[PDB]
Amino acid sequence: CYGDSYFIDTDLNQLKEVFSGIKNSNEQTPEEMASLIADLEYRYSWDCSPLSMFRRHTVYLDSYAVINDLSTKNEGTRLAIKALELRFHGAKVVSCLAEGVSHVIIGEDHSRVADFKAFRRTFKRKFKILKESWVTDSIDKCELQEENQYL
Amino acid sequence: MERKISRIHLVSEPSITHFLQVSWEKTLESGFVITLTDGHSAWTGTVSESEISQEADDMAMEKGKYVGELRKALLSGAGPADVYTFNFSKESCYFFFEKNLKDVSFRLGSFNLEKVENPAEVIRELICYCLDTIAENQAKNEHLQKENERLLRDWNDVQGRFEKCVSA
């Protein structure tokens, strides 16, 4: 129905053109899209790219003074930029500490670490506690550095 | 040319504080000038490299560490660091600062003082220097506030630009 063909092969420019052929499509919801992203990656080993390798991980930040409170944002600190960078790397940034959260980032302050640990022990699936420097280094490697040294 | 003002207490009249000014040109090694004032009458004195060398001969200890001890005693006024007491016999003209370590006492130095004919001049120049410093610091404070506001504005702009780039 669009420009692309069945039999003959197609090159970069051709693809561009056929995309320009289709007007738009906005019938999907974000969840769905992300799901499909992951799916195709798993189907065709798309995770080798420098980015999007965080797509399979949900990331929470200690950007709030009160855990699971949305009215005490601590904007104005490096933590915020860190979070945004995680988002740029495809990490699913989660405002709420849900049981499905995989990664949690903690800054220079460790006062609440114990609480985090408790929550982990409460959850059926445990999430490793990570510091802010981990990613700040891993970016240069564009790869998932071992978390043990940064545990 | 630099100088410093500090507040010291006298054992004889504890209720009433006295004010001590120490002025030096380049470094304390060459020498300096000291004045003591109390709002009515003031005394002055001088020290040269020869005097510090004689005192260092008396105490037989490093020149620089003596100089630093004097710096803390006369300028820092750091109470937490081993408080010590400045006594003064006015008639005998003997202003000495005794060091009181735990269960140990030392005589840190000996001095002589002379009464200036006009204490008004010194007690005016002191406060005049003070007001000049206040004005200079207020000006520098305003400049720093302006520059800090600029920095905050730039930080906000950069944060917004980063956010827009990631969204795109």
Swiss-Prot record, chain A:
Protein name, as recorded: DNA ligase 4
Tissue: Testis, thymus, prostate and heart.
Outcome of substituting L15P: Found in a patient with microcephalic primordial dwarfism; uncertain significance
Family in the record: Belongs to the ATP-dependent DNA ligase family.
Domain of life of the native organism: Eukaryota
Residue stretches making up the BRCT domain: 49-151
Subunit and partners: Interacts with XRCC4; the LIG4-XRCC4 subcomplex has a 1:2 stoichiometry and XRCC4 is required for LIG4 stability. Component of the core long-range non-homologous end joining (NHEJ) complex (also named DNA-PK complex) composed of PRKDC, LIG4, XRCC4, XRCC6/Ku70, XRCC5/Ku86 and NHEJ1/XLF. Additional component of the NHEJ complex includes PAXX. Following autophosphorylation, PRKDC dissociates from DNA, leading to formation of the short-range NHEJ complex, composed of LIG4, XRCC4, XRCC6/Ku70, XRCC5/Ku86 and NHEJ1/XLF. Interacts with DCLRE1C; the interaction is direct. Interacts with APLF.
Location in the cell: Nucleus
Source organism (scientific name): Homo sapiens (Human)
Biological role: DNA ligase involved in DNA non-homologous end joining (NHEJ); required for double-strand break (DSB) repair and V(D)J recombination. Catalyzes the NHEJ ligation step of the broken DNA during DSB repair by resealing the DNA breaks after the gap filling is completed. Joins single-strand breaks in a double-stranded polydeoxynucleotide in an ATP-dependent reaction. LIG4 is mechanistically flexible: it can ligate nicks as well as compatible DNA overhangs alone, while in the presence of XRCC4, it can ligate ends with 2-nucleotides (nt) microhomology and 1-nt gaps.
Entry's transmembrane regions: none
Clinical condition linked: LIG4 syndrome: Characterized by immunodeficiency and developmental and growth delay. Patients display unusual facial features, microcephaly, growth and/or developmental delay, pancytopenia, and various skin abnormalities. Severe combined immunodeficiency autosomal recessive T-cell-negative/B-cell-negative/NK-cell-positive with sensitivity to ionizing radiation: A form of severe combined immunodeficiency, a genetically and clinically heterogeneous group of rare congenital disorders characterized by impairment of both humoral and cell-mediated immunity, leukopenia, and low or absent antibody levels. Patients present in infancy with recurrent, persistent infections by opportunistic organisms.
Curated annotation (Swiss-Prot), chain B:
Region Interaction with IFFO1, residue ranges: 1-168
Documented effect of changing W43R: In SSMED; impairs the protein function in DNA double-strand break repair
Tissue-specificity statement: Widely expressed.
GO cellular component annotations of the record: cytosol; DNA ligase IV complex; DNA-dependent protein kinase-DNA ligase 4 complex; nonhomologous end joining complex; nucleoplasm; nucleus; site of double-strand break
Modification Phosphoserine occurs at: S53
Compartment list: Nucleus; Chromosome
PTM section of the record: Phosphorylations by PRKDC at the C-terminus of XRCC4 and NHEJ1/XLF are highly redundant and regulate ability of the XRCC4-NHEJ1/XLF subcomplex to bridge DNA. Phosphorylation by PRKDC does not prevent interaction with NHEJ1/XLF but disrupts ability to bridge DNA and promotes detachment from DNA.
Superkingdom of origin: Eukaryota
GO biological process: base-excision repair; cellular response to lithium ion; double-strand break repair; double-strand break repair via nonhomologous end joining; immunoglobulin V(D)J recombination; positive regulation of ligase activity; protein localization to site of double-strand break; response to X-ray
Outcome of mutating F106E: Abolished interaction with NHEJ1/XLF
Outcome following mutation: R161Q: In SSMED; no expression of the protein is observed; complete loss of function in DNA double-strand break repair
GO molecular function, one term: FHA domain binding
Residues forming coiled coils: 131-165
Keywords: Chromosome, Coiled coil, Cytoplasm, Disease variant, DNA damage, DNA recombination, DNA repair, DNA-binding, Dwarfism, Isopeptide bond, Nucleus, Phosphoprotein, Ubl conjugation
Mutagenesis / variant outcome for changing K99E: Abolished interaction with NHEJ1/XLF. Abolished ability to bridge DNA. Abolished ability to bridge DNA
Key word Transmembrane present: no
Keyword Cell division appears in the UniProt entry: no
Effect of E55R: Abolished interaction with NHEJ1/XLF
Associated pathology: Short stature, microcephaly, and endocrine dysfunction: A disease characterized by short stature and microcephaly apparent at birth, progressive postnatal growth failure, and endocrine dysfunction. In affected adults endocrine features include hypergonadotropic hypogonadism, multinodular goiter, and diabetes mellitus. Variable features observed in some patients are progressive ataxia, and lymphopenia or borderline leukopenia.
Family of the protein in this entry: Belongs to the XRCC4-XLF family. XRCC4 subfamily.
Protein name per its UniProtKB record: DNA repair protein XRCC4
Organism: Homo sapiens (Human)
